[PDB]
Amino acid sequence: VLPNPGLDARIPSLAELETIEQEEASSRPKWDNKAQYMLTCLGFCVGLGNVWRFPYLCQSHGGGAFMIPFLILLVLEGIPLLYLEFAIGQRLRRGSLGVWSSIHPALKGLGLASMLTSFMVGLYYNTIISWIMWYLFNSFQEPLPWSDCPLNENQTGYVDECARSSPVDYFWYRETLNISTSISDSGSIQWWMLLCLACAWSVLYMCTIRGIETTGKAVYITSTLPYVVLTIFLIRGLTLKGATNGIVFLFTPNVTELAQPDTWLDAGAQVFFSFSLAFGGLISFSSYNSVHNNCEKDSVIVSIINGFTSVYVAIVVYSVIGFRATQRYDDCFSTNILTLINGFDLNVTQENFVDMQQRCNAYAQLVFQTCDINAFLSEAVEGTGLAFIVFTEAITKMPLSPLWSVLFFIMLFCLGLSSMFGNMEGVVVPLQDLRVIPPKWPKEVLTGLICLGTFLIGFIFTLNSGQYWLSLLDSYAGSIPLLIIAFCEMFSVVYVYGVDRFNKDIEFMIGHKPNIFWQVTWRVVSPLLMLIIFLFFFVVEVSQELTYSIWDPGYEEFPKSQKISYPNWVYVVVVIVAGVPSLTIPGYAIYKLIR
Amino acid sequence: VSIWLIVFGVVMGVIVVGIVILIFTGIRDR
Ligand SMILES: *[C@@H]1O[C@H](CO)[C@@H](O[C@@H]2O[C@H](CO)[C@@H](O)[C@H](O)[C@H]2NC(C)=O)[C@H](O)[C@H]1NC(C)=O
Ligand SMILES: *[C@@H]1O[C@H](CO)[C@@H](O)[C@H](O)[C@H]1NC(C)=O
Numbered sequence: 001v002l003p004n005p006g007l008d009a010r011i012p013s014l015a016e017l018e019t020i021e022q023e024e025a026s027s028r029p030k031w032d033n034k035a036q037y038m039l040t041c042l043g044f045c046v047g048l049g050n051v052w053r054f055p056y057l058c059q060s061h062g063g064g065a066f067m068i069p070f071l072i073l074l075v076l077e078g079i080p081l082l083y084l085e086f087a088i089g090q091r092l093r094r095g096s097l098g099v100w101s102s103i104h105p106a107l108k109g110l111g112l113a114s115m116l117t118s119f120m121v122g123l124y125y126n127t128i129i130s131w132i133m134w135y136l137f138n139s140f141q142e143p144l145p146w147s148d149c150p151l152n153e154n155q156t157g158y159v160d161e162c163a164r165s166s167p168v169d170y171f172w173y174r175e176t177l178n179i180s181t182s183i184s185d186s187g188s189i190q191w192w193m194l195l196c197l198a199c200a201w202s203v204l205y206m207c208t209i210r211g212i213e214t215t216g217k218a219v220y221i222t223s224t225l226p227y228v229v230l231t232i233f234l235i236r237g238l239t240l241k242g243a244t245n246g247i248v249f250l251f252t253p254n255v256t257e258l259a260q261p262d263t264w265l266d267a268g269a270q271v272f273f274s275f276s277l278a279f280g281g282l283i284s285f286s287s288y289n290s291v292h293n294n295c296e297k298d299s300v301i302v303s304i305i306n307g308f309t310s311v312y313v314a315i316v317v318y319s320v321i322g323f324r325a326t327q328r329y330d331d332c333f334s335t336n337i338l339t340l341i342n343g344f345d346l347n348v349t350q351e352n353f354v355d356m357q358q359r360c361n362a363y364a365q366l367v368f369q370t371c372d373i374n375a376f377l378s379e380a381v382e383g384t385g386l387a388f389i390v391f392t393e394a395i396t397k398m399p400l401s402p403l404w405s406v407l408f409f410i411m412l413f414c415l416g417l418s419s420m421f422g423n424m425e426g427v428v429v430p431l432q433d434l435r436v437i438p439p440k441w442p443k444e445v446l447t448g449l450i451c452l453g454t455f456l457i458g459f460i461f462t463l464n465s466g467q468y469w470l471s472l473l474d475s476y477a478g479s480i481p482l483l484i485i486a487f488c489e490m491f492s493v494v495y496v497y498g499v500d501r502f503n504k505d506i507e508f509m510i511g512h513k514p515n516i517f518w519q520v521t522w523r524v525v526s527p528l529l530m531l532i533i534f535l536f537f538f539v540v541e542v543s544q545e546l547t548y549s550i551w552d553p554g555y556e557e558f559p560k561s562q563k564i565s566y567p568n569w570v571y572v573v574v575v576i577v578a579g580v581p582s583l584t585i586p587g588y589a590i591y592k593l594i595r
Numbered sequence: 596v597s598i599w600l601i602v603f604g605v606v607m608g609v610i611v612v613g614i615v616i617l618i619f620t621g622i623r624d625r
């Protein structure tokens with residue numbers, strides 16, 4: 001629609017596309033099955049959303065208050081851009097970097113930014129896989145190592161930190177992290193954390209050695225186990241006492257939060273995470289299909305499973321939250337009961353309490369810790385705590401705790417590993433297009449150079465301050481960069497390449513111009529939605545102050561949270577993690593208009 | 596004896612085996 005002079009003789013002609021399939025058997029890789037491609041897309045979509053981010057924000061926003069805005073934006077901004085990406089990859093027979101180069105020469109920043117974002121998110125997501133496998137390794141003991149507290153040197157009392165907090169909190173912050181008080185205080189490379197990091201990047205190399213060939217045979221177990229195990233955790237989930245109390249809690253959504261731009265922003269950025277959009281590893285994966293494959297039907301199947309697994313994950317999460325909250329509620333009423341009995345020597349139930357204490361009333365000397373199930377259900381764990389603090393504790397109060405531990409951390413590994421496969425494709429392929437290495441070198445080399453270079457960069461997260469880094473990195477890695485990239489893909493396919501051209505080629509491939517649904521979502525609605533969520537980013541950034549949670553035991557309220565402001569140097573780390581990728585799109589565009 | 600170390604030892608060993616096997620398998624491809 002805008003000036004794009006010389007678009008042919010930069011893009012395969014539709015007349016040539018029939019003649020470019022049978023000849024290109026060599027020099028470009030091929031999916032063994034249709035299923036082996038659909039698994040690799042689902043794996044990259046279900047593993048990059050549900051390995052961590054999705055289950056967190058659901059519990060961090062109360063559930064329905066996040067799920068509602070999510071499923072609205074999954075259909076209006078998700079489905080369109082997932083269809084667009086599958087279609088444009090299958091037509092231009094290039095990965096993400098080739099597609100935006102062919103469409104327009106100065107549109108290189110898009111493909112580059114997609115490679116930077118894919119690199120950045122995969123860097124700290126393999127640390128989370130390292131953390132996951134640490135727990136997995138520590139999950140083969142009748143007493144789970146986080147089930148009890150360590151003793152003093154005298155062994156006359158439990159460790160102070162572990163007493164003020166919980167065995168679970170201690171295993172996370174001390175036994176695993178050995179966390180320091182601030183991002184400033186950065187100690188040595190925690191050795192046991194480095195072994196797990198090595199183990200993570202290594203198994204990644206083992207599965208992405210020759211590329212889609214070797215990964216295609218990995219995604220059978222990796223894309224299927226998370227499911228089989230997620231269903232086992234539903235049957236066990238719903239047998240837990242507090243489940244169907246917490247399930248009911250996600251279905252009764254907070255509306256006050258529905259009026260916050262924060263809830264909509266986090267729901268927005270999660271659509272681009274749950275659909276693996278603007279990472280550009282899906283474009284590359286659709287670029288190995290037949291030119292006449294139904295890429296409209298694949299997008300709808302993948303999206304329907306992605307929307308269904310979100311709800312199926314929120315159910316398995318709120319089962320356990322409910323169970324936990326019931327446990328804490330009962331253990332509180334029991335204590336409130338013990339105090340009265342131990343001060344009056346009484347015969348007291350969860351029912352005859354308010355009358356009981358009333359008639360009983362020394363009463364002043366007694367202290368009763370007020371508590372209701374609602375407050376327990378509302379408790380939000382921050383960070384990675386839903387796996388390492390909420391699930392890991394609930395597992396210890398479930399018989400076959402060790403099984404429940406190994407099943408849960410294998411399904412989180414699988415989910416994280418299948419996410420890494422698509423993140424590896426969004427950095428490896430754009431390098432092969434740039435011809436960074438000499439062509440003679442095999443695939444194993446480039447892959448290995450990338451597997452070792454990042455593994456070295458992953459040492460920042462094995463420090464004592466290592467957890468704060470992964471926190472802020474994520475905060476600015478999957479935010480604006482994805483929003484911007486995702487908006488520019490929608491804009492550059494419809495207003496630069498022409499939606500009308502885009503409608504004719506799809507018609508070549510599937511035999512029909514897409515439904516008016518697609519037309520309205522692609523021309524007007526999705527770009528407008530992506531603009532509203534792009535402002536909401538700056539609306540929530542201004543009012544909030546740059547801060548973060550620290551785990552200082554010496555802190556007066558050590559158990560209570562401690563939100564300190566980041567140092568003034570951190571804005572150097574923020575301006576690069578978010579600005580560098582987001583500015584490569586204008587930056588290269590300007591550079592190409594002056595060359 | 597740390598059970599995590601034994602578990603790691605096994606897993607890290609198994610991965611290496613795969614890795615070398617894959618390298619030679621590709622080299623074998625001629
Ligand atoms: C929905 O969210 C709002 C906002 O967080 C909650 O209102 C808060 O409730 C707590 C506890 O009474 C107060 O300390 C906060 O100051 C309130 N915040 C605001 C902005 O008013 C509300 O309770 C939530 N509703 C449900 C059902 O959980
Ligand atoms: C944790 O970090 C502190 C500060 O660097 C260090 O003194 C201590 O030895 C560390 N503990 C472990 C188990 O590495």
Ligand SMILES: CCNC(=O)CCc1cccc(Br)c1
Nearest residue numbers: 050051052055384385386387
């Ligand atoms: C290790 C980082 N991950 C998390 O914090 C949450 C993960 C998580 C919790 C419960 C169910 C599922 Br599926 C995923």
